[PDB]
Amino acid sequence: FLGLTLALSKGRILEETMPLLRAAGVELLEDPEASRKLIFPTSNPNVRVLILRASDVPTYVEHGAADFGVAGKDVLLEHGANHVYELLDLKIAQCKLMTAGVKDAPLPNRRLRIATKYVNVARAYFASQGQQVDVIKLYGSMELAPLVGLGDLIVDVVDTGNTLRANGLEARDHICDVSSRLIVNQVSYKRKFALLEPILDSFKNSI
Amino acid sequence: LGLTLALSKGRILEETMPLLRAAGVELLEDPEASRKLIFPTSNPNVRVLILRASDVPTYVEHGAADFGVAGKDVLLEHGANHVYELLDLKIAQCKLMTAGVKDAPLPNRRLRIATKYVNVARAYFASQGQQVDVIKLYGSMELAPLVGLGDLIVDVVDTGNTLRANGLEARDHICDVSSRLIVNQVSYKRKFALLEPILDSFKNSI
Amino acid sequence: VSRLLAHTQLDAPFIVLIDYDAFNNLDSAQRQLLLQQVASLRQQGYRVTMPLTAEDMPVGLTHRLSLADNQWRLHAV
Amino acid sequence: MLPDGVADVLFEDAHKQEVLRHQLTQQLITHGYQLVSPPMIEFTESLLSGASEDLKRQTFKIIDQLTGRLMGIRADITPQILRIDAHHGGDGIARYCYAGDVIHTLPSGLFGSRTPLQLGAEIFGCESIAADIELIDVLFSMINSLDMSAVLHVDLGHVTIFKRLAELAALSASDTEQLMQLYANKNLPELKQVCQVLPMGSDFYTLARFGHDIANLLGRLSENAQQDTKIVTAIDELQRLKAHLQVQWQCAVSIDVTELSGYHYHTGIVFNGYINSETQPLVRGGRFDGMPRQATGFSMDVSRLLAHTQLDAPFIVLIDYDAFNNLDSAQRQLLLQQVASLRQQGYRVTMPLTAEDMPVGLTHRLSLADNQWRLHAV
Amino acid sequence: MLPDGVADVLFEDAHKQEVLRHQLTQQLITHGYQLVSPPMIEFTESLLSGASEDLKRQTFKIIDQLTGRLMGIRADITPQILRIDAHHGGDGIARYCYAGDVIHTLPSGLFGSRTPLQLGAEIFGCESIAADIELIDVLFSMINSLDMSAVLHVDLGHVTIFKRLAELAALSASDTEQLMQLYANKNLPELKQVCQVLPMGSDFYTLARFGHDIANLLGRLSENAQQDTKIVTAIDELQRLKAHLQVQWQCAVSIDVTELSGYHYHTGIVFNGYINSETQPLVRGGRFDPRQATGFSMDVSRLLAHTQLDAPFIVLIDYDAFNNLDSAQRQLLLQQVASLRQQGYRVTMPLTAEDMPVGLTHRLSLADNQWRLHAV
Amino acid sequence: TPQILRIDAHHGGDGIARYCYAGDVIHTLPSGLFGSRTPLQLGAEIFGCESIAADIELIDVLFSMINSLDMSAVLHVD
Amino acid sequence: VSRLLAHTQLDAPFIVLIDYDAFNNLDSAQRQLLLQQVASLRQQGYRVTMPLTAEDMPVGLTHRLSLADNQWRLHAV
């Protein structure tokens, strides 16, 4: 395959990306949920699409299995976007990374135990606040961890705050703002710029 | 004060429900309709947590759950160092295997392995005296070899249909996998009286 | 092998002409991007003529590569 | 199982590596560079004197049991060259080369090596662009001797252009750090935004947008920038080296004045040599501080050349065990004289210990036929 | 200031070191030894598998930040050769050579180096004395190629003699350790004392007192020792190698059957090559460890004081004359310079009128449209 | 080449025409010392353009071909 | 073009021999599956010899296609 391979994040991000694509040359022929297909052709014959876990997008781009991709800034910070170019802030799928604990519960007199998917971000954030933390790695349902004692605080993406409030939790500290970003493989940027520039300019025009 | 039971969501949960009901534990609501994280049961001394399969060993090891049902693939990858693997439940059976593209030759280099099971991959290929570059992925292992991200994969295989439907073939058998009953070291000592009747009914249920 | 010619058919070829005027309007960086694009089309089996003059036309022309709003697209003739 | 980024180099690859190390070193010596071979370990006081934070994190620490002081395993030979030049080099021009193992705590690139065989050359005491030009001539003479089909692409930068703009514009540290991130990521739109409110903003936009076109770059800059002596000279040096590379060496050159890796240690022109489409440079070089003492130099990992170079197939010879033991003493001495001559020519000749003794990769047997020892292909 | 036992090798010495390393390696390759170049670092699990306590203390430890596991900087390449032979070597005869830097935490002898350039050769899969004989012939062929005026003296030992006596006498570990200390120090009086109360004590005294006289050593031992098959063969191997060294190589040989350094790893014959009257052996070798192995190694940097290269030709092009040239004249001059460099001349293109290489022997000067070499 | 002229005269018209070919040719004597008398002759030709741009295009085609061969051997042009 | 031969290299070929004995042990359905596999290998540029006799050996053999526990795999020689 000589065209561009585009790595898209599966869930929340995919919904707000589709309008940006259609404004460019690109739109999917099938639908991701209905079809059990991994590689998707588009309206543009020079663009191919991969529908991936949000966590896997940076990996595919960095190793050049995809030429470019749309990925959450929370995922890029946690992954370490060392070997990719972060070309555009798409300003979609906006949210915040925050700390959250139980409502009105006091901080214990010890090293805080942090339950999170975002272990590098947690460690980094609490290091910047001069706090030493014991980090516990989890993959899903961060809300649960403080309720059964698994950690004192969590770190997770928060938009409205309803999931936290519905489980008796409150937000504590703002870590940073998050949005989906356009990432491009270092080598693809040099070798396939002719294919990329018109798509990059249409995404730029779409905001 | 009661026991907290950590269950794996998805494939494992289906085959666990019969084993529970025989033990006198059974859920009052259903996990699909309800977005509740903590579930009461028929037994008032038992509480249930429906978790990601990958998170079960973490909850048990730290004592946030007293015991749980977890895939052996997850335990090997996690390193079940601080928990007791008490019973082979013989449910949700599958194999961990290597798979590459059908009839494709192994390249003249360090093999690049794309997998969720990075510790298992490294260990397996180390036992075969092979040096590998491991790439961490969280989903859709089938895809990785088709776009060049890695020469082989390591993943759980049952029928082999997902591999064959994507033009891949199994290569090496690594090990057999089934869901296991795990218990927290401290819970086993402190709450054995509560555990023993449930442990014996699970034992009788196969 | 020459006796097979009357009894066999290939797929119709894709025969492309780049717009003479639009190509000469380009700066150096634009030309190198266009040539990168042309190399990729040729790798795929497109037969692409870089015109020497405004009259330079390949035999059996099927497509033009034309510039519209900073984008080189293929259009059927 | 070896650690990640750590590999044996075995057999024909080991022989190739030894040939490359030796031949490249000898070439450097014939160009007038003095070979030095500093040790793997030193006190951190000397090894990390004026080091960047990346170099410090890249350096393994160990304790000296004779003094209780901290040492490091070197991650970079260049600081040892400075130490040596300070003691032995004097005030004039001094040239040094080296080839030695270095150890890194973490790899640089994806699946990169943590134990490169670092080979390099350095010129101290010359401010002129002529010293950089000489280094290019040495490098390319070395690259061309390797007879590779792989193509080397060179990217030139010059950190002074950005450093001088940052001075004249009087940028704060956070403004400097933001532009460097935007440059690193080629974020042109957001760079355009930030530059509309910064002093001399259009100059910082111009570097990213038009820095590739080095012939016209000075004429796109603001009057304050065009009057700065250091910007005019830096741009001039870029044009000189670009021309020299194209004309003397048939080398494809790109320019990137927003290439600001090693902002800490580079003091001027920078050179990055890429092999085919591999992400990490094969060769890294440029101006640095030799201290006021000028320094310029490059280095590379000789082990990365192994995949792109070929030696002639070896001649691997076995003497017939049975026939050799049938010989009288005078016959044996004649045969050993013949064997010594073959070995002088680079044939790999095994004198067998037993009738089963067989070398790996056997190409020839040395066999007796009618009172004559000849080589026969297997 | 470098750490004790740590020195730069600079300039002509560095060039000489590189020439020695390369020429010795190439010789080994032509004798059929396969070059291997293992890494400086490994996990300790492989690097120190079955290591002695001396080797463990000699090895610097560092932590792998990718796994949290312990690694070591190698103090010895031989264990890496074993690892390699186990994977690649098969069951037959395999020959390996190597040359690489090793790091030691403490110097081995008084005023020794902690960063030797270790070069060596090893034969696996041959039980015969013929493999040891081959190694001697390779070593001495290498030594003779160096054209040294320094003489190598060889001391032979054989750890099996003492190990078999210790078995037959049924010695405890503390008794074994005391005799090894007394042997290490040749404390003959105190050895005489201790041997009066030990079982087969007079045999352990005889090794130290009369082990030098290998022709008569078997006849000085007790009837139990003379009936031991392994003692008789070990003594026989010593006599065979001694004779081979004297006759084939005109080499002075001494015997010391109480040489028990590396008691842990040596399994038989041992070889120590001394250079003039320097305390630490230049060459160390012997049988070691079911797969047979024999080998030697040396510090290439210790050869530097005993070897000489031909004086280098160091040439400077005239600055003024070169800058007077047109482009075509410069390209002709550079063609000429490339040819001189191909022949091994060290030619400096001057950057300035003061640019002078260290140790200048010749100038390349223009006289009537001709560039000729003139001695300074 | 003379067969290309014959073909161009019949089929080429007055405008620009481009031709390529690859075929065996036979020579009565070799050109160079130990040269071949049976080369596999491959080539390209542009008719109907006076401009140096036609020669430039031929160079671009040639060098695109040479670079696709991934040779370590160096081509020098006189 | 013949003067380019000394200065160019192709990737080493894959030269495959199907095991004579194992192939003749197969039932008809097993043979058709094996031939489907062989057709796919040949589509990829593998050079696969169907042996006429037990001695039929191609020049420069790199691999055998061999049956091990109801599976046809390629093994290097």
Ligand SMILES: N=c1c2ncn([C@@H]3O[C@H](COP(=O)(O)OP(=O)(O)OP(=O)(O)O)[C@@H](O)[C@H]3O)c2ncn1[C@@H]1O[C@H](COP(=O)(O)O)[C@@H](O)[C@H]1O
């Ligand atoms: N609100 C978001 C949210 N907003 C934006 N994004 C982006 O979407 C990416 C994750 O996409 P997914 O939807 O696939 O991930 P997920 O829903 O966390 O987990 P899955 O079960 O889908 O695997 C992140 O990397 C973000 O960049 C969000 N990802 C997750 N959420 C969650 O959605 C819920 C809504 O939060 P409130 O609005 O605060 O109640 C909470 O559970 C939030 O943690």
Ligand SMILES: N=c1c2ncn([C@@H]3O[C@H](COP(=O)(O)OP(=O)(O)OP(=O)(O)O)[C@@H](O)[C@H]3O)c2ncn1[C@@H]1O[C@H](COP(=O)(O)O)[C@@H](O)[C@H]1O
């Ligand atoms: N076949 C299994 C399978 N069998 C048993 N299990 C167990 O189920 C656990 C994971 O449960 P999940 O619900 O998370 O499985 P999942 O497929 O990741 O589900 P999603 O979260 O992705 O929706 C594992 O730890 C195993 O112990 C399996 N988990 C995943 N699979 C996959 O299911 C697919 C069908 O396999 P075949 O039918 O053999 O092709 C393949 O992609 C397999 O990799």
Ligand SMILES: [Cl-]
């Ligand atoms: Cl809140």
Ligand SMILES: [Cl-]
């Ligand atoms: Cl299969």
Ligand SMILES: [Cl-]
């Ligand atoms: Cl390096």
Ligand SMILES: [Mg+2]
């Ligand atoms: Mg350096």
Ligand SMILES: [Mg+2]
């Ligand atoms: Mg002609």
